[PDB]
């Protein structure tokens, strides 16, 4: 299991916006977290949240299976990091 | 945990080859597996193995932490799927 931590300082999201190729508006919410990838300290990682989802609260989380998909070259890829409480 | 299965029919790798941009030869070994992504049946996924590593034997496996890296846009990515026995 991948250990992900949302620190007290990471409790908010920021929002970027713009317009798609054929006219539609979009908004993307982004939140930071720390993921332990087995180095000396956890590393900082940016997450784009799904529509209508609040920022995750501070605490410990692991990665949900829906984070993954098979890509166009047939290998596994991350679609978007989606989290569940530890 | 991601459940990965190497079936009896997937016990071998195939090898692709070629030459890099500035002259070096390369060989890449590829092996297939089934990964349970929570749909009605597991899906077929292609893996590129690391240098000097044999094909994984038939059986159940989970994903090692070294499979992941932070990408150039700061989000988590899969580098190469690396497995350990379940």
From Swiss-Prot, chains A, B:
One of its GO terms (molecular function) is single-stranded DNA binding. Gene3D superfamilies: Nucleic acid-binding proteins. SUPFAM superfamilies: Nucleic acid-binding proteins (SSF50249). One of its GO terms (biological process) is DNA replication. The record marks 16, 21, 26, 34, 46 as: Involved in DNA binding. InterPro entries: NA-bd_OB-fold (IPR012340), Phage_M13_G5P_DNA-bd (IPR003512). Keywords: DNA replication, DNA-binding. The record marks 41 as: Involved in DNA binding, and in the dimer-dimer interactions of the protein-ssDNA complex. Transmembrane segments: none annotated. Homodimer. Binds to DNA in a highly cooperative manner without pronounced sequence specificity. During synthesis of the single-stranded (progeny) viral DNA, prevents the conversion into the double-stranded replicative form. G5P is displaced by the capsid protein G8P during phage assembly on the inner bacterial membrane. Belongs to the inovirus G5P protein family. This is DNA-Binding protein G5P.
């Amino acid at each position: 299991m991948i250990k992900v931590e949302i620190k007290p300082s990471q409790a908010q999201f920021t929002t970027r916006s713009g317009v798609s190729r054929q006219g539609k508006p979009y908004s993307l919410n982004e939140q930071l977290c720390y993921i332990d990838l087995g180095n000396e300290y956890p590393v900082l990682v940016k997450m784009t949240l799904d529509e209508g989802q609040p920022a995750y609260a501070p605490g410990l989380y692991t990665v949900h299976l829906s984070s993954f998909k098979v890509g166009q070259f047939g290998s596994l890829m991350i679609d978007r990091l989606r989290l569940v409480p530890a």
